[PDB]
Structure 1
Amino acid sequence: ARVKRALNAQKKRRTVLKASKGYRGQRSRLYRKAKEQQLHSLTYAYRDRRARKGEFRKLWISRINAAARANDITYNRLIQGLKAAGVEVDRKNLAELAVSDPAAFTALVDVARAALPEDVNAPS
């Protein structure tokens, strides 16, 4: 029985273009040019979904370093002192505090310097 091809190709091609809505030129109007860079777009989504955690952590650390230098301490010294004091707060909350409560950073840097040892160049 001959099965002539009306809806089968149409459904998939329409779903491809519908997902590809919002591009420029032939991109959002033309199928053979849609699927290619549709897949490229979603591959970019896959890659930068991992890249986003790295970029956000980068910005996060940058803000924390800014706050530490405003409070007259380096990022590495602040983190080492925080680990020595045993505070488990993460860079998300530190960055939100830096945006929010310099009183919170004042207390935190005071704790970090208190927990900092006598000499940083000791062989210990």
Structure 2
Amino acid sequence: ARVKRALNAQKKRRTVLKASKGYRGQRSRLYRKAKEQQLHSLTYAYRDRRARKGEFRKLWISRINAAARANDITYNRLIQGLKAAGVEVDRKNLAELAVSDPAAFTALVDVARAALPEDVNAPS
């Protein structure tokens, strides 16, 4: 039985070419170049899914730092005071409060300042 290769190959070629819509130049037209770019794209996506959590945490920390310095307190002392006070709001919702409900953020800053020690540089 002589077997022609067309159907089996066309299947995966169509899959790869469809996945490469929107690419520039050869990378969206030719199957080989599109396949190379697909390897790179999936590697990039895998790496970026891991890095995205850190990126968003960095953005939240930036916003919380801005809103805390607006209340005359630094981010690190505010985090220490919030941990001491036992409140368990994470940085995502802390930034959400900072942007959407400034009064709530000010109240949390007040409780964090209350929970802080009297001399932060003491050998405690």
Give 3-state SS (helix, strand or coil) of 2:28's partner: coil
What is the distance in 1 between the residues matched to 2:123 and 2:96? 36
Q: Deviations over 1:73-96 (max 9, x none)?
A: 000000000000000100011011
Kindly report which structure 2 residues correspond to 1:100-119, keeping only aligned pairs within 5 A, or say none.
Answer: 100-119=100-119
Q: Deviations over 1:30-56 (max 9, x none)?
A: 111110011101100000000100100
Give 3-state SS (helix, strand or coil) of 1:71's partner: coil
Give, in angstroms, the shift of residue 110 of structure 1.
0.6
Q: State the TM-score, normalized to the length of structure 1.
A: 0.97
What is the distance in 2 between the residues matched to 1:56 and 1:70? 21
What is the distance in 1 between the residues matched to 2:106 and 2:63? 15
In structure 2, stretches of 5+ residues that fail to align are none
Q: Indicate the percent of aligned positions where both proteins have the same amino acid.
A: 100
What is the distance in 2 between the residues matched to 1:34 and 1:106? 53
In structure 2, what is the equivalent of residue 54 of structure 1?
Answer: 54
Give 3-state SS (helix, strand or coil) of 1:88's partner: coil
Give 3-state SS (helix, strand or coil) of 1:7's partner: helix
What is the distance in 2 between the residues matched to 1:44 and 1:8? 28
4+ long deviations beyond 4 Å: none
What is the distance in 2 between the residues matched to 1:59 and 1:84? 24
What is the distance in 1 between the residues matched to 2:9 and 2:63? 51
What is the distance in 1 between the residues matched to 2:80 and 2:104? 18
What is the distance in 2 between the residues matched to 1:110 and 1:66? 16
Q: State the TM-score, normalized to the length of structure 2.
A: 0.97
Give, in angstroms, the shift of residue 6 of structure 1.
1.8
Q: CA RMSD in A?
A: 0.7
Identify, as 1 or 2, the structure richer in helix: 2
User: Paired residues, what number?
Assistant: 124
Q: Deviations over 1:3-25 (max 9, x none)?
A: 11121100110101001111011
Q: Deviations over 1:96-121 (max 9, x none)?
A: 11111111011111101111111112
What is the distance in 2 between the residues matched to 1:37 and 1:49? 18
